[PDB]
Amino acid sequence: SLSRTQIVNWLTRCGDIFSTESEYLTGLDREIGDADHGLNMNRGFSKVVEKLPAIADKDIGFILKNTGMTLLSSVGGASGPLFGTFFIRAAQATQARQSLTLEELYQMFRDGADGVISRGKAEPGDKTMCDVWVPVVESLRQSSEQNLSVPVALEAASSIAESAAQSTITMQARKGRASYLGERSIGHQDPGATSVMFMMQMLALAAKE
């Protein structure tokens, strides 16, 4: 099972990673966008994390939804609404729970991903966060098929996140500001996708035995 407080620990670690990797993520976004993604993500999660002390004892749905809206209101640019939607849609799917099964994490990732895909309309291979979300979702699905423990599922999901992020360097952007570069977006890792990768690495850690 994955505990509410592990989830709080996730968001905490996301706060850290988005602080530490601001520069790097903004690097990625210079190459193929307006050089703001690390600024955007740090702003958002630093807000997310400042809020944890007040909300940390409410239920998982409450924390994710509230996180969702912070991101929604605070990240800005194109990713903000997408990460927001992810968490908000992840929230519902979480009946006021307090821990989570592998199966409920899958479903919550599944719905979060559907939300981002239906919102921003990216297809696999377009070079966006979705190129990480989809395989991560798919990992959780098979990990759930095999009834692995949450921690090992999450660690598997995590290294797939790494591969999937890596695999975007080669894709040409069909979506968002990076598409403005056309063929010049090939050869560069997507920022958004790197962020999802960061979130999943912190999730793996938060949940570590």
Ligand SMILES: Nc1ncnc2c1ncn2[C@@H]1O[C@H](COP(=O)(O)OP(=O)(O)O)[C@@H](O)[C@H]1O
């Ligand atoms: N449908 C989408 N449209 C635009 N960006 C998307 C979409 N889906 C995912 N993304 C992500 O948004 C990221 C850029 O976010 P960010 O730099 O913070 O916003 P902006 O490009 O508006 O400055 C891209 O790297 C990409 O991963």
Ligand SMILES: [Mg+2]
């Ligand atoms: Mg940008």
Ligand SMILES: [Mg+2]
């Ligand atoms: Mg922007």
